[PDB]
């Protein structure tokens, strides 16, 4: 069925699928869940907008599949590792009145030695800002 | 791993060690626009393998929260076409935890200007 299939393999349709489900998947902190077919990028990290809170990255396709979006990896080449997050970010704190955050930003240079260089400009030029063309 | 191996991987994908630290990997600590600011003497030497790692990794995002939450922009520059990213990652309040929480992630910001 649908939830056996992830984006490297497919599991035996006789097993259990082992994507979790929203109710579990929704029991982790914000910025350790992961969107699949079973728990898409809305549900876990709420919409794409424009207001400086929201997300802003996604088009539908990759909104309602997350990891299982065909060209998952390509786009996760990018997301930092633990230790690079905070190796490579400016972190703050802010106390504000919807709560205390850990503030972060930073900017990851593209390898324009990488054979794929102009595929990962034109991938990630579709998901963008994405949802300012949504019907 | 070595540091000549660990250097290899992408920067975004490096994994700091004491083998390879977190200004072998990541660039000395310092206050410009897109220098890294954190981490005081243990860490950056130390990079994952610091003690109190894993509570600092707790709000680390996941790839797919990376792009799930954040602003994310692109711009091309003579340096190269770069990726350039803004979010925030809310602490929990209510956790028994939380003050120690807050008191690690103040140890570790801006903790270079204290030393050379």
Do not use: C
């Not at 998947?25 to 929201?54: D, H, I, L, M």
């Not at 990896?73 to 590792?81: K, L």
Request: charged fraction near 20%.
């Amino acid at each position: 069925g649908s939830s056996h299939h992830h984006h490297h393999h497919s599991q035996d349709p006789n097993s259990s699928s082992t994507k979790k489900s929203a109710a579990e998947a929704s029991k982790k902190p914000r910025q350790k869940r992961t969107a699949t077919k079973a728990y898409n990028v809305t549900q876990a990290f709420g919409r794409r907008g424009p207001e400086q809170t929201q997300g802003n990255f996604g088009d539908q396709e990759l909104i309602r599949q997350g990891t299982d979006y065909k060209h998952w990896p390509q786009i996760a080449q990018f997301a930092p590792s633990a230790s690079a997050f905070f190796g490579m970010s400016r972190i703050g704190m802010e106390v504000t009145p919807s709560g205390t955050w850990l503030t972060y930003t930073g900017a990851i240079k593209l390898d324009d030695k990488d054979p794929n260089f102009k595929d990962q400009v034109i991938l990630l030029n579709k998901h963008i800002d994405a949802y300012k063309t949504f019907p």
